[PDB]
Structure formats: C-alpha cells, structure tokens
C-alpha cells in the first residue's frame, strides 16, 4: 500500500507507506586471489599454440606488475550534512593486511577450504574468500604442458581454458586501474552473484538482514566498495566493504515541494515561498532520519535504501510541518524569492504544478488528450487517469505506480503576507526567521510614529 497527500496550503506533498532499509555500519571482507610465481620459459617455440599461451602469460605477468604499482599507494538542505570517510573502515582492515605474516595467516587458513574466518592480529574476525586459484591451476595444469622438452601443445582446449581462467584477473585489474584501487558499485568481476550471496549467508547478521540483502543484491552492489589492498607472497587481496542495514522496516515518507507564489497580474509584484525541507524522512530510534539529497536513496517497490552518512538526525516534531507549517514546536524551513517561474514536481503518485504568469500548463491522457488546464497558482493532479503534464515547453511523464492520492484543500499560505514587509531575499530561512524579519521591518515603521 502507498498513499500520497497534497497540501494546497503549502504547495507540497508527502508520500507514505514505504519501509526503511538504512545503512548503519559496515562489514569488511577480504577477497583473495592466489597467484603463481612464473619464471622464464627458455623455448623459442614457434608452435602456434605455444605462442598463444605465451601471449596470455605476458598479459598475466603484466597484470601482476600493474597491480604491484597500485598497491604502493594508499587508497536544498544538502549543505547541512556532515562529512564522512566512506572507506575508512575498509582501509583500516587493509592496513592490517600489510603487517608481517598477516597475509600468511589468510593464505594458510584457506589451504584446505576456499572460505574461512580469520582472526587478525588486532582481534577483529573477518570473512576471507578465495574466488580464483591461479597458482593451483598454473602449477597443476599448465606448467607441465608449456615446459615440455618437445615444446609444443597437444590440443587447442588448454590454450582456451587458460584464457577463460585468466580473464577474470585481467578485468579486475582493469577496473582498479581506472578507479585508483577503489571501485563502486562492486562489479561481478570483483564478486560474482554466487560469491556475494554466499558471503551474505556466512555473515554474522540476523536472518532478516540476510534475506533483505539477498533479495536486493543490485542495491547492495551499489552501496559497496572494493578496495585494492596488497599483492605480495603470491596472494592478491582486496577488501570488499559491504553495507550493514541496522534499521529495517520503519516508516519512511518522501516530501515533495514546489514554489508557491501570488498570482497578481502585475509582472514583478508577486512574492514566492518554497518549503526547503524536501527529501526523504525515516523513523529511526525515536528520531527521524532526514536525507536532503533524495538522489542518494534508491526505491525498490516500497523499500527505500538510504545511507545514514547523508542524513541528519532530527526530532520527530519535524513531521508537524506537513499538517501545520506554523506549529510552535518545530521551525519549518523555507526559502523566499520574487522569481515566479513555472515548473512541475513529479511526485510518487501525481504531479505538483506551479503555474505562474503567461505559462501554458496542462495535463493530458494518452487516449483523450488534454483533460485539465491549470490556472495560476500551485495545484496538483493525481496519476489516476492522467499520463502527462506540460508546463511551458517542458513535458513531464508521471509515475504510473499504483496508489491512492488525497487532495487536502487549503488556502495558499502566500496570501497571508504583506509584500511591503515581506522579506523576499531569503535563500536559507524559516517560519520563525521570516517572522522576526517582519517585526524588524515593522518596528522601524512603528518607532517612527512613536515620535509623533
């Protein structure tokens, strides 16, 4: 179920009914590839199959040399957000891997199995996964065939098989080389769908968390980092940093806002108001997580994946701005201007239309064509029976998501202000800031008659 409410009084709309999936922490996994130490091949074999193997081996050797170079380097209201270090956790685990004998532990731990839990020297337990064993393959399948005294290859399949196995190593290095050892999203070369699902299943997390991550692997990939760490002692290791979702299934809602202007015929005599607090809101541990950059959240059906690094923690009273922008308990954030330009905001279940001046604003159906022409002011139409909206030369398609919309009638609040004392130059203000500014303009007028 999804619903949406449009508030005519404040030219805004809230879509409710969504469930949260907030990233709260990080899990760090060490992914290793075992490499083979390959010395010179003293044959000048002109056999066509030996030549292709030797060419593939040069690509293999250049990849290792390339990664060794990489491992020598250390890997409206948005402006209110803090500044994190997105891979501080992953890089911290990587630093430990550079200590003496730490790589040897992972390597010997993964000698019998390809998946193990290793305790690092500092005490943290990390899942370690070997995704490709080239050391075993090269030492057990291709070294004898190349080094043969005869110096020729029996069949075509060995050349092809090596190219298949080596390809993954070549692609991983390619990505790291153009991302300075840190990639996001995590591609299928770094971690296949099978390996990731298996890693999630072996993680020390609840069963609910495992299910959520397994059914939304594409979002997990986009919120994960792969950090190139060490390549030493025949081991290539990179750290994959997976999101931990510590908040699940709490109510979330999306606030959409659009400019609300007076509609006088005199061109520049109009004043405008826009709620600046648009973005995502989720209930979280007794407060509300507010994500001003709504483009940092991904909506899948009715589940919203957000990252708390891009959030503020606000008192739950922030919700009062939707039903009463003048409430005394929370200072609702707004901006002011005199730029009464036309535009539309496409919501979850409809469209807000701010239509001013001489702009042509209409809504059309695919079958019947234009079914509503908007007048001056801020208005709203539901997506039921409506397919497109036009504001000036801009055509907007509306979302065809199923769900009920409610039109909450109300007097546009822009009509309550006197333009002679209306502060219309505020880019980052609020209800209370506009109030105190009006009184500072009214006191300069009041204390003049006080002399008379």
């Amino acid at each position, epitope marked *: 179920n999804i619903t949406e409410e449009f508030y005519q009084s404040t030219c805004s709309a809230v879509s409710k009914g969504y469930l949260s999936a907030l990233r709260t922490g990080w899990y760090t996994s060490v992914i290793t590839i075992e490499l083979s*130490n390959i*010395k010179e091949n003293k044959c000048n074999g002109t056999d066509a199959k030996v030549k292709l193997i030797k060419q593939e081996l040069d690509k293999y050797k250049n990849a290792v040399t390339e990664l060794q170079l990489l491992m020598q380097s250390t890997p409206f209201l948005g402006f209110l957000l803090g500044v994190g270090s997105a891979i501080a956790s992953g890089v911290a685990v990587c630093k430990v891997l550079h200590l003496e004998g730490e790589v040897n532990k992972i*390597k*010997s731990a993964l000698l019998s199995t390809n998946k193990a839990v290793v305790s690092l020297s500092n005490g943290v337990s990390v899942l370690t996964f070997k995704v490709l064993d080239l050391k075993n393959y090269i030492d057990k399948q291709l070294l*004898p065939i190349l*080094n043969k*005294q005869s110096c020729s290859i029996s069949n075509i399949e060995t050349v092809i098989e090596f190219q298949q196995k080596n390809n993954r190593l070549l692609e991983i290095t390619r990505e790291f080389s153009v991302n300075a050892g840190v990639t996001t999203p995590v591609s299928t070369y770094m971690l296949t769908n099978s390996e990731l699902l298996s890693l999630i299943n072996d993680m020390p997390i609840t069963n609910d968390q495992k299910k959520l991550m397994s059914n939304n692997v594409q979002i997990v990939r986009q919120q994960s980092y792969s950090i190139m760490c060490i390549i030493k*002692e*025949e081991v290539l290791a990179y750290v994959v940093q997976l999101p931990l979702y510590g908040v699940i299934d709490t109510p979330c809602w999306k606030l959409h806002t659009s400019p609300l202007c007076t509609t006088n015929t005199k061109e520049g005599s109009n004043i405008c108001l826009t709620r600046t607090d648009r973005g995502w809101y989720c209930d979280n541990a007794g407060s509300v997580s507010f994500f001003p950059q709504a483009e940092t959240c991904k909506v899948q059906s009715n589940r919203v994946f957000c990252d708390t690094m891009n959030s503020l923690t606000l008192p739950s009273e922030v919700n009062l701005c939707n039903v009463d922008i003048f409430n005394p308990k929370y200072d609702c954030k707004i901006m002011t201007s005199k730029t009464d330009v036309s535009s539309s905001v496409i919501t979850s279940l409809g469209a807000i239309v701010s239509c001013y001046g001489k702009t042509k604003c209409t809504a059309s159906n695919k079958n019947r064509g234009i079914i509503k022409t908007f007048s001056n002011g801020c208005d709203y139409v539901s997506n039921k029976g409506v397919d497109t909206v036009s504001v000036g030369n801009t055509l907007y398609y509306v979302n065809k998501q199923e769900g009920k919309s409610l039109y909450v009638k109300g007097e546009p609040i822009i009509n309550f202000y006197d333009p002679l004392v209306f502060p219309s130059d505020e880019f980052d203000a609020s209800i209370s800031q506009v109030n105190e500014k009006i009184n500072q303009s009214l006191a300069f007028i009041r204390k003049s008659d006080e002399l008379l």
Partner: antibody
Amino acid sequence: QVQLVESGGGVVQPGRSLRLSCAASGFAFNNFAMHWVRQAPGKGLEWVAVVSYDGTSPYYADSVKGRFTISRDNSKNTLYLQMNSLRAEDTAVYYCARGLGSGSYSWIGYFYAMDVWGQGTTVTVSS
Amino acid sequence: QSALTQPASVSGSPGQSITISCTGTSSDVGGYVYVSWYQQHPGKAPKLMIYDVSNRPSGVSNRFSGSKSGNTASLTISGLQAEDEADYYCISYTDRNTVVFGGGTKLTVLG
C-alpha cells in the same frame, strides 16, 4: 656452513603417529624448497614429499598421499614431516634435502632436484 | 609412482668409460629436461652429480657427463677411479607434479 641436521630417531609401534624434525642453518631458509627422501634398508631411494618456500604448496608421492603431511616453519628454520598410521614398510632412513633453485617459486618442477642433504635419522616401526 | 628402469649392476676398470641407463616414459624422462643423477656412498648421504640433462655443479670433475636420447638418460664416467665405486640413482619430474627415483645401479671398479 650449509648443514641440515634431523633428530628424533626413536622407535614407534605400527598404527601410531610420528613427527620428524629437520633443522637448518647457514643459509636463507625462507628462500629454498625442502624435500623428504627415505631409503629402505638395502633397497634404493624413494621420494616422499616436497614443500615450497613458504609451505603453501606441498607435493606428496602417490604411495604416500593421504598418510603423511609435510610442513615448514620459517620463523624457526625447521622442516617437519607428520606420519600417521605407520606400517611396517615405513622402516627407512628419512633424509632431509634442500631444493635446487632459490626463489619465491611454488611449482615442484622449478626445484625438483636436491643439492644439500642431511645425515638422516633411522625411523623404525615395530610392534 | 612408477619407478625408473636402471641396470642393477655395472662393471668397469680404472681408466675406462662406462654408461648407466635410466629409462622412463614420455611423462617422466622422455618429455622434460628435469632429470638429475646422484651418487651415494654407503653410509654417507647421496651427493648431486648431474643436475638437468648434462649440467654439473662446482666440485664434481669433468669425468662425469650426462646425456639423454628418447626416453633414456645416460650418465657417463670417463676414466674410472676407485673413488667412483658407489651406487648411482636418477631422478626425474614425473609430469604428475611429483618426483620419482630410479631402481639404482651399483658401479664396481674391478680390482
């Protein structure tokens, strides 16, 4: 001096486990491969197992795979050879030999040979 | 592991030259250069004489030479001496990622 000294030449009954020890000195131990070679009384030599420079990739003989496990400790410059389910045919003098080819290589073909040998400890199984 | 075919006994006199056989298959001997020879005096540990087909380390004389044709490697001792009377073995990489030894040859200088 490049020398390999194995010790622990005791007696053990069949079916019981035994652990061989081989010490090293006078050379960079964490750069060479190590071999185990046994020799039955009067009979010829027989290859047993090989461990690479860091003990990651071992190699065992077909007549031995599954029963013996060879390991290495670079922090002590020592080579080991675990032996489980000993049978009467294991009566042999187990030599401790180095590989022929310094380097961080992992393939048995790069160090199949032996250049420096130990003295050998007589391992006797008898109930 | 299938052993390597070596002649059991080889006789010779001081000043002569003699050859020891070491027959394998296309996997062990007749396929790779990785074939070595070892001299073992009774009591003392074996000693490396020829590494690879013909290469020899420092210490051993010019009288020890190695060769290989087909599936058989050959060790030649030119100008025999009483110090040469010992057992000789041949090793080889086995293509199956192990190492295999030979049957052994007891070279006796005729006194």
